[PDB]
Design a protein around this nucleic acid. Structure first.
Lengths: 158, 137, 108, 103, 85, 143, 73
RNA sequence: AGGUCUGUGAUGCCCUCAGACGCCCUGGGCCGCACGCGCGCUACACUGGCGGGGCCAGCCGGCGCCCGCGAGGACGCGCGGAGCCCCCGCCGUGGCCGGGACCGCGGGCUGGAACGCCCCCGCGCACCAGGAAUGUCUUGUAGGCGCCCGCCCCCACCGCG
């Protein structure tokens, strides 16, 4: 139903305006048609996805996948801050990965000391690179010889 | 709030509460019906009505200011039709039962109308949330 | 030898409207909603005149059968030939298509 | 006076539609404002067999007609009945670019 | 045969005074305005046809065109349809 | 459920309507072994008779067995509707019943006779064994 | 071919199955089905009884499969 | 000398031209079935079937209320998105709750007109991974899962996406 590029999402008018102005940071993640927008501020360590905490995301098995950067970097920073994510686009898993990308990038922007930002980059990218750099590959078009992009209709010679 | 608790425990706990507290009652036609043309046999539990009721009220609370029609709910309870030596197709659920449920809710003021459809009323929010917090522990 | 509990002797000389609720969906639709068309009505009236007073030929293959058409002989078209049909109660509420075959069984 | 007027312009080619846009923006800065809204592109699609007879490899044509639409409803009360005319005749008369005005 | 009447029983059963649904297709208001005449063309039916070559087969009604697929590739460039992608 | 051990009266194989039934199957799927009874009609019948449905058919005490019979000859009284029956609007008496074993075979035979003497299209086709509905022949359906 | 019962004929439950299982470190519904040649459902019921008693305990659970550990040793 | 004179107010030469091969009406047929084969669809089960619940797309996109088991229907307004998958249970290797062809009662929709298409109860065919032979494929690819448009009064196991 949701479309990702909608203006109602990128600005996150969901939040009320007096509260919309306390959020300093902004961030983006993506994977396939999925897009996630994060509004990071100052708090005491709370995260939300579509008005749902991080412990109760639904595929269940990937909860570790979204909690990864915390147990990597450490909980100190996140405990310092508080976040409110919102995602919209194709697929459960795509949404998972977009969300984790947004987490990581946003916490990267919270620090102002570039040196620490680079150190954290090295610390984190080594474990994985898709936590910072978006995956580029995307669904590809089909052709009229058959019912697939590269597969063809079966041919009968005799 | 309600979304800070998993949907699975809330639904069944609240159904038991509802059935105890005489809020709703299963009519007579429940004794021999499916819940959709897509189905194939009847439900195995004797207390499926109250499960549906709880899922519905939760749906209405989630939306909030928005308004939900009956058929729109019935598109959330769809399934797939099989057994036709033909590619399967998705079909919509039933509407009589949904209609009965919303009517029963509305007769109690838990649910209020509008220009189109219905939406939750403040009393509904009160009770839903208080029950959720009670089961939070 | 009955018809939905209705006795046969009474079945004839009865009006279609009396029995209509005791028929299938097609007949109720065609009659109560789609009414009927003029040429069919003239066919019925011609039948009445002949009864009150020679085999009646026609082309109508989609003409439902009425109770007043019991024991009558009428010749209907297959696309090339005119084919007799003798009516009896259990043939009521049905079309003339079933009782006039347009082809013949295949024997190799 | 004030008539909440709206300007809609439609075209099939993207080069005049953007040229008409600039002229109008130039000529409507005074009679109020005239900022544009760019709509999603309505693309008409037609797939046809490349053969008139149906022989050989099944090969297909893929035509389409993109239609671009822009909407300046910014006049609003800032234009009177005659004031709309002023600019609409001062803008270039490109041969093809449908225009309709409504309050 | 004006002096032809029928029993009343065979009158109410007649089809209700309703306009036969089949309306034909008038591509333009110009091409119409509502012995043998009794049965010249009583079988009213859709007669949608190409507005170029008049054939009743393979007619794109999409977008209110009404052009045959064959009678289309020729005039497509004039109309504005182009082949890209 | 929670029936682990065979009850003292467990009956290893049931006979009813000339058909035999085993006592290891759940009740509502065993009755499907009768001709005239399926899944939908069974759940409805038992329930009206105050019988558990998730029970192994061997623990079916004869007291519950008889009341079940009483509901398959006069089902319409017992609250079951009429769109759930095998035979709605019989051709003669115009009533509605449910026909079990033995009745079905006799009933099916007499219709064909009705079809034959009446001289229909279906009757003539049945007797050379062709497709009755309009499903196409010729292609496929060959040895 | 092979047939297995769905209901235990009285003393059979305890004179073997209970005894046999209690002398196993790990177990599952299907193993016990194939071991003493009874259907799986009875296995479910019995293992319920036993976890209630306390001899066995759950180490992994799921609708498709759960497995137990003998806490009696 | 590949296909198209049966796409056309594109056409040469022939044939038909008032019991017409012109045009219009009524019916039937193009679908008929001892047989050989071409592209597809559904399955042969536990890496599963049934029942209940939770949840996310894109080409793009319309809904409320009340009847009816349902399919559908009467009124009234402009508003709006799924399967696989995940969680809990039942079944327990039995051609069995796998599979859903065939047939017997019944209720509706389109239409001038059902032979057409939908829904309900009962009956419950072949099929245990397929011989000689053979096709397609390298990253968001194969495969699996569903959703839209075209032709269309009704109807998609097809086709473009």
């Amino acid at each position: 139903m949701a479309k990702g590029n909608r203006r109602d999402l990128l600005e996150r008018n969901d939040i009320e305006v007096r509260e919309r102005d306390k959020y300093t940071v902004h961030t983006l993640g993506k994977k396939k048609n999925s897009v996630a927008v994060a509004f990071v501020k100052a708090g005491k360590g709370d995260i939300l996805v579509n008005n749902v905490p991080l412990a109760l995301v639904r595929p269940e098995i990937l909860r570790t996948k979204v909690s990864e950067p915390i147990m990597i970097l450490g909980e100190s920073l996140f405990k310092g801050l508080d976040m409110n994510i919102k995602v919209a686009g194709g697929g459960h898993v795509s949404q998972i990965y977009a969300v984790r990308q947004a987490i990581s990038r946003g916490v990267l922007a919270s620090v102002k000391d570039e040196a620490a930002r680079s150190e954290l980059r090295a610390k984190l990218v080594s474990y994985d690179r898709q936590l910072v750099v978006s995956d580029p590959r995307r669904c590809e078009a089909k052709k009229f010889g058959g019912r697939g992009a590269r597969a063809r209709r079966q041919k009968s010679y005799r | 709030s309600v979304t800070r608790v998993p949907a699975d425990v809330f639904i069944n706990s609240f159904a038991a509460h509802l059935k105890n507290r005489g809020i709703i009652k299963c009519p007579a036609f429940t004794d021999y019906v499916k819940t959709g043309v897509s189905r194939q046999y009847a439900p195995r539990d004797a207390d499926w009505f109250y499960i549906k009721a709880a899922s519905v009220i939760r749906h209405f609370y989630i939306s909030g200011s928005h308004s939900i029609g009956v058929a729109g709910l019935a598109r959330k309870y769809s399934s797939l039709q099989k057994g036709k030596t033909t590619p399967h197709h998705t079909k919509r659920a039933s509407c009589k039962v949904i209609r009965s449920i919303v009517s029963q809710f509305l007769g109690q003021k838990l649910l209020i109308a509008g220009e189109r459809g219905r939406h939750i009323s403040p009393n509904g929010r009160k009770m839903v949330e208080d029950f959720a917090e009670g089961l939070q522990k | 030898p009955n018809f939905r509990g209705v006795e046969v002797e009474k079945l004839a000389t009865m009006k279609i409207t009396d029995i209509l609720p005791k028929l299938n969906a097609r007949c109720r639709r065609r009659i109560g909603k789609h009414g009927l068309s003029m040429k069919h009505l003239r066919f019925v009236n011609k039948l009445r005149l002949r009864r009150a007073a020679k085999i009646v030929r026609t082309h109508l293959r989609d003409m439902i059968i009425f109770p007043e058409m019991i024991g009558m002989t009428v010749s209907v078209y297959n696309g090339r030939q005119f084919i007799p049909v003798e009516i009896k109660p259990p043939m009521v509420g049905r079309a003339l298509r079933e009782y006039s075959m347009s082809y013949k069984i295949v024997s190799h | 006076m004030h008539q909440k007027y709206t300007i809609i312009v439609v075209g099939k080619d993207l080069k005049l539609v953007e040229r008409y846009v600039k002229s109008i923006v130039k000529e409507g800065r005074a009679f109020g404002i005239s900022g544009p809204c760019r709509a999603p592109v309505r693309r008409l699609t037609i797939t046809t067999r490349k053969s008139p007879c149906g022989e050989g490899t099944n090969t297909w044509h893929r035509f389409e007609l993109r239609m671009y639409k822009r909407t300046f409803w910014v006049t609003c009360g800032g234009n009177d009945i005659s004031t709309i005319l002023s600019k609409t005749v001062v803008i270039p008369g490109i041969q093809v670019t449908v225009e309709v005005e409504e309050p | 045969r004006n002096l032809g009447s029928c029993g009343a029983e065979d009158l109410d059963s007649r089809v209700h005074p309703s306009t036969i649904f089949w309306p034909t297709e008038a591509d333009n208001i110009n091409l119409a305005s509502g012995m043998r005449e009794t049965e010249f063309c009583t079988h009213i039916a859709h007669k949608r046809e190409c507005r170029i070559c008049g054939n009743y087969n393979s007619v794109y009604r999409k977008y209110g065109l009404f052009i045959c697929r064959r009678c289309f590739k020729e005039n497509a460039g004039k109309i504005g349809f182009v082949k890209l992608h | 459920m929670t029936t682990i051990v065979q009850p003292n009266d467990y009956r290893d194989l049931l006979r009813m309507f000339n058909t035999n039934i085993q006592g290891k199957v759940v009740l509502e799927c065993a009755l499907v072994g009768i001709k005239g009874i399926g899944r939908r009609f069974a759940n409805v019948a038992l329930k009206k008779a105050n019988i558990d449905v998730h029970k192994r058919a061997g623990e079916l005490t004869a007291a519950e067995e008889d009341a079940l019979m009483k509901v398959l000859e006069d089902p319409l009284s017992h609250g079951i509707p009429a769109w759930m029956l095998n035979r709605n609007n019989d051709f003669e008496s115009g009533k509605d019943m449910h026909i079990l074993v033995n009745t079905i075979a006799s009933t099916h035979r007499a219709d064909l006779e009705r079809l034959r003497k009446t001289r229909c299209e279906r009757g003539v086709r049945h007797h050379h064994n062709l497709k009755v509905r309009g499903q196409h022949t010729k292609s496929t359906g060959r040895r | 071919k092979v047939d297995y019962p769905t209901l235990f004929a009285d003393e059979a439950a305890m004179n073997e199955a209970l005894k046999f299982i209690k002398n196993s470190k790990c177990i599952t519904h299907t193993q016990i089905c194939e071991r003493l040649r009874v259907s799986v459902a009875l296995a479910k019921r019995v293992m319920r009884q036993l976890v209630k008693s306390g001899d066995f305990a759950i180490v992994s659970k799921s609708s498709r499969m759960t497995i137990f550990k003998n806490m009696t040793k």
